[PDB]
Nucleic acid binder design. Sequence first.
DNA 1: CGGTGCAACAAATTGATAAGCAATGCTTTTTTGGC
DNA 2: GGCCAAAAAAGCATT
DNA 3: GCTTATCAATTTGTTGCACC
Length: 204
Amino acid sequence: MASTKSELIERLATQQSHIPAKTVEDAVKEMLEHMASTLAQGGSGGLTKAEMSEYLFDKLGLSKRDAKELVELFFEEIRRALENGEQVELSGFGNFDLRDKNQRPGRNPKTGEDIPITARRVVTFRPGQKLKSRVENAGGGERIEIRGFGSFSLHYRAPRTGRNPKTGDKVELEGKYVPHFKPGKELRDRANIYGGSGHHHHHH
DNA sequence: CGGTGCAACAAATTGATAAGCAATGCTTTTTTGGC
DNA sequence: GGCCAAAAAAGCATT
DNA sequence: GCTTATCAATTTGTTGCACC
Ligand SMILES: [Mn+2]
Ligand SMILES: [Mn+2]
Ligand SMILES: [Mn+2]
Ligand SMILES: [Mn+2]
Ligand SMILES: [Mn+2]
Ligand SMILES: [Mn+2]
Ligand SMILES: [Mn+2]
Ligand SMILES: [Mn+2]
């Protein structure tokens, strides 16, 4: 129950024959590189699906039509993996874990009435060191938003005196930014094996 | 390529509970690039 | 596409 | 060990992207 960058590019390939494997492969790499770049430097504002397609077109001369069908598939394969209980691990970027959460005390932040947070399975993103370094080294860039899949943004970490967990020595840590992912609705419902039933849909 | 419409977004409230993390060396997994 | 040695990244420790 | 994130329900304003 673990899908790597390669095992994923393999599934996208076997489902995109009209597209050469080496291309189906370069694409995934370019996307993750565009994504990583966006978060660290960004520049071109928020990254979207149409930005990742245009880039593929520009960088790999790939037809826009196929570039779009891939980007979409790319995120669709990951979703498929996760909902199956599989964790997606992408080298040089980050891993997408699955965690089963037990019910805990909640409430209505507005009213204050105790309303418990049901047990569920949530998807989480763990930024690799490679990527984390870029974000702090670059000084942080823009964000990424892929509807139905999830969003990537940068969170600020104020400076603080930290400890070498081994020696106990203090170390001076500078403020920095770090990547943060928020699963999209479509991904939260498919991944959470506690809601694949009668959906929630009433008007009052 | 350019314009619309709308559900999926971000942000905002409290507060008990869960998850992550500062340095760094050894181990292990993954990828890389030639054949 | 598979084999392989090396390089890179992640993993673990504990994070 | 200390610090950051999770999440509840609901409103207000923004926006990605399917679809003309
Ligand atoms: Mn693994
Ligand atoms: Mn162009
Ligand atoms: Mn299944
Ligand atoms: Mn992991
Ligand atoms: Mn955030
Ligand atoms: Mn490393
Ligand atoms: Mn342990
Ligand atoms: Mn502890």
